Design a protein around this motif. Structure first.
Motif, PDB file in Angstrom:
ATOM      1  N   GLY A  52     106.200 -10.670 -16.043  1.00 54.26           N
ATOM      2  CA  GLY A  52     105.519 -10.251 -17.495  1.00 54.26           C
ATOM      3  C   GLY A  52     104.164 -10.116 -17.802  1.00 54.26           C
ATOM      4  N   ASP A  53     103.382  -9.871 -16.471  1.00 51.69           N
ATOM      5  CA  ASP A  53     102.116  -9.551 -16.681  1.00 51.69           C
ATOM      6  C   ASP A  53     102.116  -8.182 -16.961  1.00 51.69           C
ATOM      7  OD1 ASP A  53     101.141 -11.856 -16.389  1.00 51.69           O
ATOM      8  OD2 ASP A  53     100.357 -11.490 -14.352  1.00 51.69           O
ATOM      9  N   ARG A  54     101.324  -7.540 -17.960  1.00 49.48           N
ATOM     10  CA  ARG A  54     101.072  -5.888 -18.156  1.00 49.48           C
ATOM     11  C   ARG A  54     100.168  -5.467 -16.912  1.00 49.48           C
ATOM     12  NH1 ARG A  54      99.160  -3.418 -24.107  1.00 49.48           N
ATOM     13  NH2 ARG A  54      99.199  -1.345 -23.568  1.00 49.48           N
ATOM     14  N   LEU A  55     100.294  -4.272 -16.462  1.00 45.97           N
ATOM     15  CA  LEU A  55      99.698  -3.670 -15.437  1.00 45.97           C
ATOM     16  C   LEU A  55      99.078  -2.402 -16.404  1.00 45.97           C
ATOM     17  CD1 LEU A  55      98.452  -3.056 -12.631  1.00 45.97           C
ATOM     18  CD2 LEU A  55     100.564  -1.730 -12.014  1.00 45.97           C
ATOM     19  N   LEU A  56      97.669  -2.389 -16.505  1.00 41.74           N
ATOM     20  CA  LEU A  56      96.649  -1.496 -17.287  1.00 41.74           C
ATOM     21  C   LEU A  56      96.421  -0.419 -16.681  1.00 41.74           C
ATOM     22  CD1 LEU A  56      94.746  -3.919 -19.391  1.00 41.74           C
ATOM     23  CD2 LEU A  56      96.888  -2.882 -20.099  1.00 41.74           C
ATOM     24  N   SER A  57      95.991  -0.494 -15.353  1.00 43.73           N
ATOM     25  CA  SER A  57      95.140   0.414 -14.608  1.00 43.73           C
ATOM     26  C   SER A  57      95.135   0.023 -13.061  1.00 43.73           C
ATOM     27  CB  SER A  57      93.862   0.446 -15.014  1.00 43.73           C
ATOM     28  OG  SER A  57      93.021  -0.529 -14.239  1.00 43.73           O
ATOM     29  N   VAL A  58      95.054   1.113 -12.234  1.00 43.81           N
ATOM     30  CA  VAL A  58      95.227   0.971 -10.766  1.00 43.81           C
ATOM     31  C   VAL A  58      94.178   1.920 -10.390  1.00 43.81           C
ATOM     32  CG1 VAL A  58      96.511   1.812  -8.714  1.00 43.81           C
ATOM     33  CG2 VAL A  58      97.740   1.065 -10.751  1.00 43.81           C
ATOM     34  N   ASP A  59      92.969   1.284  -9.763  1.00 48.58           N
ATOM     35  CA  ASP A  59      91.701   2.107  -9.380  1.00 48.58           C
ATOM     36  C   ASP A  59      91.127   2.803 -10.536  1.00 48.58           C
ATOM     37  OD1 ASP A  59      91.767   0.899  -6.881  1.00 48.58           O
ATOM     38  OD2 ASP A  59      93.079   2.497  -6.116  1.00 48.58           O
ATOM     39  N   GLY A  60      91.139   2.211 -11.682  1.00 46.06           N
ATOM     40  CA  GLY A  60      90.479   3.090 -12.878  1.00 46.06           C
ATOM     41  C   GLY A  60      91.397   4.074 -13.324  1.00 46.06           C
ATOM     42  N   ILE A  61      92.583   4.278 -12.863  1.00 42.52           N
ATOM     43  CA  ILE A  61      93.332   5.134 -13.447  1.00 42.52           C
ATOM     44  C   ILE A  61      94.164   4.367 -14.443  1.00 42.52           C
ATOM     45  CG2 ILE A  61      95.241   6.667 -13.027  1.00 42.52           C
ATOM     46  CD1 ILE A  61      94.456   6.915  -9.759  1.00 42.52           C
ATOM     47  N   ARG A  62      94.132   4.848 -15.778  1.00 44.01           N
ATOM     48  CA  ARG A  62      94.652   4.062 -16.672  1.00 44.01           C
ATOM     49  C   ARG A  62      96.227   4.400 -16.703  1.00 44.01           C
ATOM     50  NH1 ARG A  62      96.736   1.269 -20.009  1.00 44.01           N
ATOM     51  NH2 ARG A  62      96.292   0.817 -22.032  1.00 44.01           N
ATOM     52  N   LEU A  63      97.130   3.382 -16.961  1.00 41.76           N
ATOM     53  CA  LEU A  63      98.522   3.984 -17.197  1.00 41.76           C
ATOM     54  C   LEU A  63      99.029   3.969 -18.416  1.00 41.76           C
ATOM     55  CD1 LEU A  63     100.053   1.541 -14.112  1.00 41.76           C
ATOM     56  CD2 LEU A  63      99.023   3.549 -14.007  1.00 41.76           C
ATOM     57  N   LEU A  64      98.362   4.367 -19.174  1.00 44.34           N
ATOM     58  CA  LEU A  64      98.725   4.770 -20.815  1.00 44.34           C
ATOM     59  C   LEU A  64      99.027   6.279 -20.542  1.00 44.34           C
ATOM     60  CD1 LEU A  64      98.755   3.880 -23.515  1.00 44.34           C
ATOM     61  CD2 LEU A  64      96.250   4.648 -23.998  1.00 44.34           C
ATOM     62  N   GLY A  65     100.227   6.637 -20.993  1.00 46.23           N
ATOM     63  CA  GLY A  65     100.554   7.923 -20.805  1.00 46.23           C
ATOM     64  C   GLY A  65     101.106   8.517 -19.700  1.00 46.23           C
ATOM     65  N   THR A  66     101.201   7.770 -18.488  1.00 47.75           N
ATOM     66  CA  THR A  66     101.641   7.952 -17.485  1.00 47.75           C
ATOM     67  C   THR A  66     103.363   7.593 -17.245  1.00 47.75           C
ATOM     68  OG1 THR A  66     101.284   5.605 -16.272  1.00 47.75           O
ATOM     69  CG2 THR A  66      99.657   7.649 -16.023  1.00 47.75           C
ATOM     70  N   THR A  67     104.005   8.383 -16.764  1.00 43.59           N
ATOM     71  CA  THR A  67     105.539   8.303 -16.629  1.00 43.59           C
ATOM     72  C   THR A  67     105.841   7.173 -15.800  1.00 43.59           C
ATOM     73  OG1 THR A  67     106.065   9.807 -14.863  1.00 43.59           O
ATOM     74  CG2 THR A  67     106.302  10.637 -17.243  1.00 43.59           C
ATOM     75  N   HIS A  68     106.876   6.547 -15.534  1.00 43.07           N
ATOM     76  CA  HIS A  68     107.386   5.566 -14.482  1.00 43.07           C
ATOM     77  C   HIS A  68     107.059   6.154 -13.159  1.00 43.07           C
ATOM     78  CE1 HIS A  68     109.153   1.936 -13.136  1.00 43.07           C
ATOM     79  NE2 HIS A  68     109.670   2.676 -12.073  1.00 43.07           N
ATOM     80  N   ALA A  69     107.480   7.216 -12.903  1.00 42.64           N
ATOM     81  CA  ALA A  69     107.452   8.126 -11.571  1.00 42.64           C
ATOM     82  C   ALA A  69     105.899   8.216 -11.336  1.00 42.64           C
ATOM     83  CB  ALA A  69     108.238   9.413 -11.732  1.00 42.64           C
ATOM     84  N   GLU A  70     105.159   8.644 -12.381  1.00 39.97           N
ATOM     85  CA  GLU A  70     103.647   8.814 -12.011  1.00 39.97           C
ATOM     86  C   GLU A  70     102.935   7.511 -11.825  1.00 39.97           C
ATOM     87  OE1 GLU A  70     102.631  10.837 -15.861  1.00 39.97           O
ATOM     88  OE2 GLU A  70     102.891  12.678 -15.035  1.00 39.97           O
ATOM     89  N   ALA A  71     103.406   6.445 -12.297  1.00 37.34           N
ATOM     90  CA  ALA A  71     102.780   4.993 -12.071  1.00 37.34           C
ATOM     91  C   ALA A  71     103.222   4.678 -10.625  1.00 37.34           C
ATOM     92  CB  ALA A  71     103.425   3.852 -12.960  1.00 37.34           C
ATOM     93  N   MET A  72     104.495   4.996 -10.330  1.00 38.21           N
ATOM     94  CA  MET A  72     104.891   4.436  -8.691  1.00 38.21           C
ATOM     95  C   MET A  72     104.051   5.272  -7.925  1.00 38.21           C
ATOM     96  SD  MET A  72     106.791   6.199  -6.309  1.00 38.21           S
ATOM     97  CE  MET A  72     106.582   7.738  -6.062  1.00 38.21           C
ATOM     98  N   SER A  73     103.768   6.621  -8.256  1.00 42.69           N
ATOM     99  CA  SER A  73     103.224   7.607  -7.409  1.00 42.69           C
ATOM    100  C   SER A  73     101.680   7.110  -7.080  1.00 42.69           C
ATOM    101  CB  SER A  73     103.107   8.951  -7.632  1.00 42.69           C
ATOM    102  OG  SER A  73     104.779   9.281  -7.556  1.00 42.69           O
TER     103      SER A  73
END
Length: 95
Positions: A52-73
């Motif tokens: 249930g936690d929201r994942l906002l960013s991965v190494d300063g890459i914001r996951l706003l506007g990223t597709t599921h596949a882009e987030a996985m990559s």
């Protein structure tokens, strides 16, 4: 209250040990949310992340506007040590 927390994880077998749902879409698009944490895995052992936690960013890459596949990559291609910014209802007290 709802606050952002930085969690550093070290991948093993190029995995963090959690499941994600969500991602952006041309049609507006849902936040990226952790749905499961693998017992014994890096996320379980670090201990913070929960379903249930929201994942906002991965190494300063914001996951706003990223597709599921882009987030996985993004998760697949980041270094072994990764800073993840998550968001949940945090209890925090000065002692």
């Amino acid at each position: 209250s709802m606050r952002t927390v930085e969690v550093t994880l070290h991948k093993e077998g190029n995995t963090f040990g959690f499941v994600i749902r969500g991602g952006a879409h041309d049609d507006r698009s849902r936040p990226v949310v952790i749905t499961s944490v693998r017992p014994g895995g890096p996320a379980d052992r670090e201990g913070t992340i929960k379903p249930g936690d929201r994942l906002l960013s991965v190494d300063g890459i914001r996951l706003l506007g990223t597709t599921h596949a882009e987030a996985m990559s993004i998760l697949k291609q980041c270094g072994q040590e990764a800073a993840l910014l998550i968001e949940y209802d945090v209890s925090e007290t000065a002692v």
